[PDB]
Design a protein around this ligand. Structure first.
Ligand SMILES: NC(=O)c1ccc[n+]([C@@H]2O[C@H](COP(=O)([O-])OP(=O)(O)OC[C@H]3O[C@@H](n4cnc5c(N)ncnc54)[C@H](O)[C@@H]3O)[C@@H](O)[C@H]2O)c1
Ligand SMILES: NC(=O)c1ccc[n+]([C@@H]2O[C@H](COP(=O)([O-])OP(=O)(O)OC[C@H]3O[C@@H](n4cnc5c(N)ncnc54)[C@H](O)[C@@H]3O)[C@@H](O)[C@H]2O)c1
Ligand SMILES: O=c1ccn([C@@H]2O[C@H](COP(=O)(O)OP(=O)(O)O)[C@@H](O)[C@H]2O)c(=O)[nH]1
Ligand SMILES: O=c1ccn([C@@H]2O[C@H](COP(=O)(O)OP(=O)(O)O)[C@@H](O)[C@H]2O)c(=O)[nH]1
Ligand code: NA
Ligand code: NA
Ligand code: NA
Ligand code: NA
Ligand code: NA
Ligand code: NA
Ligand code: NA
Ligand code: NA
Lengths: 339, 340
């Protein structure tokens, strides 16, 4: 498959380290039924968690991960809930008392977040704030947030919201509440992504729609990225911003041409449709020459400074009442260059 | 195919009636990316709506229906929003001023709603209240809610919530804000349903899991159910509880055996796993002998009495904080017999 070709095959996967980290923990995964969340759930079971609390607001996604894990039904609890509902979330944390939260709930589609910037702010930034605050209040030991390469020097609403989430969570970290954020690039074949789009175009005898002939993305298999996130979480002492080594990036045109070749449909045209609002031709390379190494060659630690939460809480209030979200985000993330 | 075999093929589908109802309207569909919602969206485009506002809190679902309708992108607006967010929802209604709301957003899985009764209450009852209240305040002309056979003499939290939603919306109907609810039974191949589960078990060489050898459901194709919902909305004058003729029910064991035969499997067993909490062996037959006929042989009107909205609103406030949801629902819906 195209997925096989573009896998990272990291040499530094470490099952026993992840097992030592997760063994007999109560773990709560937000966005449990999503592309990333579902793989986190599966690896929590694989690596010995005692009790998995699966939180998702999408009933089909929750249904599906719970069904996928039916052999482990006695050790999993499906919680149908938005992380925006602080009272209910608080009751869940009090009831089950997780020691680890893995936070993979967010809105991610760049065009939809450009079209719905208030909902992006609410779901991503406020959702993160509510979940992180409830975690810290309820004495959750460790909190790992999934982040993304689009958070680095962002040019779109989505990526900027994730950068605010990084600032918030990392600035919450202290001696009793250890926070890590892990940035990585595209996961092969995630929900609503380019590979399934191109497969559907081919199955329907449609030209492939390519945004720009030069566009590239970095890719990893979901199982690779997730296990590396868990390795990073295991070694985290709190306050770390981790970045994953994605390998070489992939030109999307080469992806398109390879899928046409694999399907034997080279009679199909590749049609160029144009770069979309806020879209980058090349996402930022994650690992900086001054980032710190870890014991895993695939995981580095990027610099981050805490911000004053009295400031950031005020600005988060502002984002909820302001007439121009793009301008309000720029006040928090001065490197935001909204395309 | 199995869906072909179980299609209702109603004789009284009326394309020109639906077109007359929908042409040049601004229509908002809640749950627009869902099984029912997505078909509503597709039919709104087919039958001539001017502008479709698609509201869904699930980003993938919204993405998918917006993508499916890409040839019509200039007349559709994807709104990534929970209907529980009243302030944002009011802004949408004030901005776009839909004339018709088709309400297909809910949680429907009986087992998950048994496990998460508070979220079933909030998403179904409070969501419906917020959307219905906003619609009436924003002078939406007509509001059509999707309901279900499980709302009749309910035995599970899900079905009981939908019953409360019927009571609320119908009690809000007046001379200026016309409400209809439409009950129907199972849609063939819906999200997370038995046919996809059986298909996946067969494709992965697993025994089929059957809850009980005698269990039956009523089935219709999604396009048939949705067109009849729209025909019902079209003829509604406000306050109607409509029910669809589903035809004969289907034993799930016969469904299982037919799926095995369609794939020439004689290697797979059917394993009986048991009736789940709140589950009925036979959902209620929707058409009562005293229901009123309409001009469509597939659509009838059931009796329903308005309730006092000041009382029902107090009950809804209580449902949000109470410890005893099953008991609280029974106080609102006296015919609720919770199969615990
Ligand atoms: N897919 C990728 O390629 C990729 C790569 C790197 C990082 N990420 C990041 O990981 C995160 C998730 O991505 P994904 O691909 O799994 O997306 P997804 O949409 O498949 O999964 C997210 C899950 O979170 C749930 N959810 C969203 N908002 C919620 C809320 N308020 N409460 C409860 N549940 C909620 C969704 O229903 C869904 O099941 C995003 O921030 C994304 O940017 C994704
Ligand atoms: N599927 C069937 O067989 C069937 C038959 C008859 C009636 N119904 C009823 O129709 C309704 C929808 O069923 P379905 O099969 O389409 O389910 P579904 O889960 O496929 O679709 C529901 C949609 O509503 C969305 N949604 C849910 N809560 C929301 C909220 N708060 N705000 C915005 N969006 C929200 C979901 O994301 C989803 O896309 C349910 O009440 C169900 O009982 C279903
Ligand atoms: O129909 C499509 C969809 C996506 N893309 C490109 O494929 C890459 C991956 O897009 P996807 O939606 O998978 O993920 P994103 O990088 O936006 O998170 C991006 O460079 C897109 O511009 C494309 O060329 N055609
Ligand atoms: O694995 C399954 C799932 C469902 N069912 C039965 O199939 C019918 C339809 O179930 P579905 O989940 O499709 O819809 P529901 O009727 O619960 O809305 C019901 O009688 C279920 O008990 C079954 O026998 N095995
Ligand atoms: Na090891
Ligand atoms: Na999967
Ligand atoms: Na399975
Ligand atoms: Na369980
Ligand atoms: Na401070
Ligand atoms: Na006609
Ligand atoms: Na579909
Ligand atoms: Na559009």
């Amino acid at each position: 498959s195209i997925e096989d070709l573009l896998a990272r095959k990291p040499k530094d996967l470490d099952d026993s380290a992840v097992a030592a980290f997760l063994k007999d923990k109560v773990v709560l995964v937000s966005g449990a039924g999503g592309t990333i969340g579902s793989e986190l759930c599966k690896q929590c079971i694989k690596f010995g968690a005692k009790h998995l609390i699966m939180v998702d607001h999408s009933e089909y996604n929750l249904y599906k991960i719970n069904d996928d894990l039916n052999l482990y039904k006695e050790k999993i609890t499906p919680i149908l809930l938005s992380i925006l509902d602080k009272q209910s979330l608080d009751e869940v944390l009090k009831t089950y008392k997780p020691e680890l939260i893995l936070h993979a709930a967010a809105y991610k589609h760049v065009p939809l977040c450009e079209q719905n910037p208030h909902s992006a702010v609410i779901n991503n930034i406020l959702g993160t704030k509510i979940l992180c605050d409830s975690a810290k209040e309820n004495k959750v030991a460790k909190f790992v947030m999934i982040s993304v390469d689009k958070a680095v020097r962002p040019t779109n609403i989505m990526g900027c919201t994730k950068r605010v989430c990084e600032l918030y969570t990392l600035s919450m970290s202290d001696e009793n509440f250890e926070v890590a954020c892990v940035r990585f690039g595209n996961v092969l074949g995630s929900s609503g992504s380019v590979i399934p789009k191109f497969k559907a175009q081919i199955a329907n005898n449609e030209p492939l729609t390519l945004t720009h002939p030069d566009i590239v993305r970095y890719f990893m298999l979901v199982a690779e990225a997730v296990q590396l996130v868990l390795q990073a979480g295991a070694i985290a002492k709190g306050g770390e911003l981790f970045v994953l080594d994605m390998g070489k990036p992939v030109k999307i045109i080469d992806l398109a041409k390879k899928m046409l070749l694999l399907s034997n449909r080279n009679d199909l045209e590749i049609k160029i449709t144009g770069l979309r609002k806020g879209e980058k031709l090349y996402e930022e390379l994650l690992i900086d020459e001054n980032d710190a190494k870890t014991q895993y060659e695939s995981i580095f630690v990027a610099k981050n400074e805490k911000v004053d939460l009295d400031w950031l809480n005020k600005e988060i209030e502002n984002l909820q009442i302001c007439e121009d979200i793009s301008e309000a985000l720029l006040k928090i993330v001065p490197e935001f260059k909204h395309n």
